Amino acid sequence: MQRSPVEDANCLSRYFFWWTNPIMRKGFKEKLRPSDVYQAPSQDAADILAERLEKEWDREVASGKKKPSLLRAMARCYIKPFLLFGFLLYIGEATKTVQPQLLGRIIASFDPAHEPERANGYFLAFGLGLLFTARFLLLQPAMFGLHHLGMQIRIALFSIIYKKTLKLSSRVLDKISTGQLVSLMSANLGKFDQSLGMAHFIWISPLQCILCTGLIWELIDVNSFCALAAISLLGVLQAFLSHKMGPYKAQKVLLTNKRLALTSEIMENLHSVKAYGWEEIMETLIKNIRQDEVKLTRKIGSLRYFYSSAYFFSAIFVIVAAVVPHALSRGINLRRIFTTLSYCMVLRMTVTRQLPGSIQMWYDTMRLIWKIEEFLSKEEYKLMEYDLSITELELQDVTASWAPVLKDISLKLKKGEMLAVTGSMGSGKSSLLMTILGELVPSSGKIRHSGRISYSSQTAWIMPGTIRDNILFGLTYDEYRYKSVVKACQLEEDLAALPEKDKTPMAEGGLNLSGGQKARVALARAVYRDADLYLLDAPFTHLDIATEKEIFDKCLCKLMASKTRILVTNKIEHLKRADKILLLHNGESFFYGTFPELQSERPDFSSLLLGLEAYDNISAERRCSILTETLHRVSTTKWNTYVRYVSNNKSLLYVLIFILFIAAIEIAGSVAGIFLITDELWREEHTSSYYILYIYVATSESLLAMGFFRGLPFVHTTITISKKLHQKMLHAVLSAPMSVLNTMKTGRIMNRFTKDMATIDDMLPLLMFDFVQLTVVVVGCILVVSIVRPYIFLAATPLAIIFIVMRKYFLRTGQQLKQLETEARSPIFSHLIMSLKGLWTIRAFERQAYFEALFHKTLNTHTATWFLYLSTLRWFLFRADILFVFFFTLAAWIAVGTNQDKPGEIGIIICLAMLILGTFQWCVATSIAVDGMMRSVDRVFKFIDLPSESSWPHRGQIEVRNLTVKYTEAGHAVLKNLSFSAEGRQRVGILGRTGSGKSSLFNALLKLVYTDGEISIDGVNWNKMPLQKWRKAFGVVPQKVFIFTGPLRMNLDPYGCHSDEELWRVAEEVGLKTVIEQFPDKLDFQLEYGGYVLSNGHKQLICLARSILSGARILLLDEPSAHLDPVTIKVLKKTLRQSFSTCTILLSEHKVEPLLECQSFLMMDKGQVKTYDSIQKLLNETSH
Ligand SMILES: CCCCCCCCCC
């Protein structure tokens, strides 16, 4: 669409990345959008990437022998780029070995004997810088290349699995699990692609290690093996911790679910939780189960410190133990040490840093490739063989299995004729169609149908978009057909009713349009479609006496009756209309024919089936069950967000005060040592003396590293902040007003607790320690180098000031550019999940290519987004790395050319600078990862900032005059100036418009929306009684009652100050004792999963009890009739009378039978009220 600039790029511009400049600019000025970002390169296109690998895999399957392997397939054409970069990494890393030798010459140039050699001093230091630059230029493009290759791989690899998953055998589909299919492709996107770049190291590290170890001198002195053994013992020490981690993870991962599932319960039914008015027990209950999670997290975190720390303390341990044996014999020499130190730390890093990460990958990627290899071996859908036009379908003793599901069906169906089939709920209801379609395979028999076959399924689904797109669905628009079909489908009302008419957008499911309208548009496909055979499967789920006979009489008889039809339904009129009928019995045939023939077969069945007089008006589920019975019967980051994070725990400030002090002391001592010691070292030869300290001065990483007394409290003080910061959120969301809380719709609140809270709790505290640690090493190093050579400050100050500005520049565009990846990620799954549910239908209209094509475009958007980001980072790293060699070369070039006669201080300056490069890249690398994570905590603060909020003298009257709500929506019957004169201790009823916001009137009194007018308790305003004291009054018992996981003791009594006799005596008076007697442990029995296993009717009684436990003034009723029945209604009626006779009741009911019971009934419309006691005055308005 937008046309990408890399297409029209120059070899230099593409190498250094000149093309990002405008997109770098834009993002700094104005915020970016999906329309602004532009497409991927023509090379990187999913059609081109997949189609190649298809051919090369096809070759492996074509040569049909042994067992094809995708690794061997991909190898047929992915090596040419892989081995091209392969050398670049090796030659790019091999330059590191040369650096020691050139350092040694500078130590060889300078000593108290002989004059200070200038020429070599300068030109060899510069000559080092040449190699030092050369390392980057060769490594950078290769490193960036492998990411491009890794990205290029999986783009094909999702296409090749998707091609298969659209067409498999249907039997195996209900063997294979849903989570395995999704999670396999969900896990790979971010991790796999980035991970591929370090695979090469598997042979790089050994090839260097063997060369380095051999290149180390003192081969006669068997101590380089001891120096290797020092690296071995480090590996043992680390691995020992990895075993001790696992036991604690299993304890945490089990616990973390308990709160996460419970939060999902409590948050969804919040309206009740507030209506009862708890907010005290729900805190402490969560806090109690949190305790173990905090203890275990702390116990893990403190352990993990040593795993990171050991690497820092290693350098001094390995370096000393390597050299001090050589101290015994062979006197002492300075150029001997420095070279052997430099060679050590290369091998120390390359064995511990990346060698694990290389091996780590090949275990994963191969284990994953195994899963694809298994998956592609799975059995396939047999392609349709309808391509004939001899004669229509005729079967003969056909058997099938999923006790065979079908056993010897026989029907010689003649063309252009009508047919109907039905039976029990099972008994081969939906299966017989699948064999005609070709979804299920016939076990034995002869089935053969000519010409193309249409289909309409049981459960309908809607492709997201236009209505005509669903209806016409890969056809061309025409005059009459569409009109007559849409007219015949009973959508003439829905034609006029909708605003955009045919262009109305639809998505998600059945929220926008109703299940009835879904069932219409479902049928529209097959009715609009042209075919040789028509197959419907239970299209009349709805109980429409008009619609059923309208569409059956008008559409079929007039339009479709010339052509053949099969239908599954339960209507005697349709059965009597049909030419041929068929009845089943669990795979074996009951009978097929017509009622006149049936009268000469089973006259008792003929009569007793017909016995129901008013059969057409019976409910679908009812009459189906009657048939079932009778048949079987008969037969932007900010500076503040850090300040807030530190401001919680003061201990995080009080820990930082003395960890700064140690840096100044340990700097000062090294400055003193470098200045004071050196002269005596040279003077020693011309004893041990002070060489061993002079080693420790050089190892700046291991010098300023943090131990247990100095650094451990940092872990303790940080984790406490995540505990506190949790409380502030949970309390703030729980205690908040229902207005701004109502817009979000719980697809976002849980998301914070699931993902965002876990990353602040788990991944942050540890990750911060690196950022604190590494900065101290680099800052503390440079200053020691600075103090000795004053003019370094002028070299340092511009580069630092540049370096921060670069980061501010990259982050503003980058953070905005990155989120578009995570947004663009979501379509790819949504498109997969939806495609599975219509797998039967999507084949029937041969519409695979359309979806297979549509699938690519959702990838191409994502890969374009990703590719731009990934490069932008590569730029920043490259510019930042080059900016170091300036610092090195300037410092080095000036150092030797100083106003100082004594050059022995150079030996430190150059050596102690060279080692930082490894830490420098590593330090800036985390610097993005921290700053990105800091955006996540900011979301929690936004939630924390969200706004927030005795006796009755034997009385319980209510008459709230002048009540006006301020929600402005209540079923087109909003409360304005409301009033009623109902006496206390009287049962009351209520009515209004059919759909007048029946709920809103209740929660207006409970105060879950904005309200006006005074509301007095018999002359006692809320003035005295706050929101809790008010909510003590009303007894609520809604259609969706609230039960949570735990025992009935905890459900009935949250606070826990009621006696056992008190708990029983209320229960038996409510009428819920003998029903409970059957359960064990009195009332201590546990309930789970919302208490679904228990009975429906008693699930009200438990809440009705809860009110007697709670308080006595007023009760409410939100239409319980749907959850009521003859035996329950009478006890519910009588026990209520015996129980209360004090508190008022309000009952909203659309039915007439509830009107006979109560005293008075309101007939309420917007600004209109009326009610009377006596039946002549009461009923007259609502008589009809
Ligand atoms: C596409 C391959 C380009 C590699 C450039 C290497 C430059 C080496 C200069 C020392």
Ligand SMILES: CCCCCCCCCC
């Ligand atoms: C928000 C402050 C970030 C400080 C980064 C310091 C980097 C210094 C590199 C020499």
